């Protein structure tokens, strides 16, 4: 599935992401844009051997298990395949475990480099929330 911006914003809100640990809603929409381009089935094999899965690109060496990555920790305790659904529940639940404090969105390099310091609220203005 490929989400439109307002459609994803509404779903993320219903799933409790607005102000989660002090982070405004637009941060999460901006991150999804640069990580998977709103595509719920996106994947990316990193040179280091791990692969990133889904709308929020969850990693296979630390967070989910793909049974093919050396040193897998699987901290979210979930198979990487289970994160490719059209329903964002699983991906949101793992994202909440990753961000344990007010500085946790640093977990996504694309957010740190391309979202932090910009008007992230611009991604949600005009969306009927």
């Amino acid at each position: 599935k490929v989400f439109g911006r307002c459609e994803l914003a509404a779903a993320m809100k219903r799933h409790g992401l607005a102000n989660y640990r002090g982070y405004s809603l637009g941060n999460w929409v901006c991150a999804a844009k640069f990580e998977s381009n709103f595509n719920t089935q996106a994947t990316n094999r990193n040179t280091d051997g791990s692969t990133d899965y889904g709308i929020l690109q969850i990693n296979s060496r630390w967070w989910c298990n793909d049974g093919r990555t050396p040193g897998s920790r699987n901290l979210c305790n979930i198979p990487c395949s289970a994160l490719l659904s059209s329903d964002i529940t699983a991906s949101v639940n793992c994202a909440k475990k990753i961000v344990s404090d007010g500085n946790g969105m640093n977990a996504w390099v694309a957010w740190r480099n391309r979202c932090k310091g910009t008007d992230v609220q611009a991604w949600i203005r005009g969306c009927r929330l």
Partner: antibody
Amino acid sequence: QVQLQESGPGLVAPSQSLSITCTVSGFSLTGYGVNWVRQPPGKGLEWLGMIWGDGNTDYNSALKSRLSISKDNSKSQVFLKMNSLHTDDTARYYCARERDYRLDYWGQGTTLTVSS
Amino acid sequence: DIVLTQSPASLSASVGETVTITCRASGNIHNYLAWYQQKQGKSPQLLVYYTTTLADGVPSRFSGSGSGTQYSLKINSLQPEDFGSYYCQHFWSTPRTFGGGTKLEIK
């Protein structure tokens, strides 16, 4: 430790322009915005404008034609320039860091008086 | 532009009393409202953000509420260090504006 400090000319003639510098430390200007706010003696706060981490700018509607904000990321400095001074411009000027829609750290301010 | 109407202009109260300040906007600001406290001769300090979140180190006696166009700040059993001025500020798009301020004074 996040710190912000303003530097200005104190007294300026209505024939010249206003230029104030905000020197910061403890964080990178590329990841946070910086807002400018003023307060006339004995009065309330007035929003002047801002520069986002990415360099984009936004200004107070009534004052936009005579204000200009810029910055130097490598030197950790933000600049405010204002022209066409009036005695109504007499006030304490502050720079403040913005973090995800709240002004979390403020400078001590610098006073400015418009001469005749 | 969206303007903020803050009331009342001043309050006279005693330690131990509870007080409330209101801030109403001319247009919907979608919960993007913050509150600041300013002591005599000092710079403003952040108290609350996104309507209800208390800033670090801020005492639990302070509480914020609101939605759409109407908001409020409440201080339960006020203490000596709470006297001073208070200001609301919105962050819905640009330009941003501040309310006119409220002066909390000893009765």
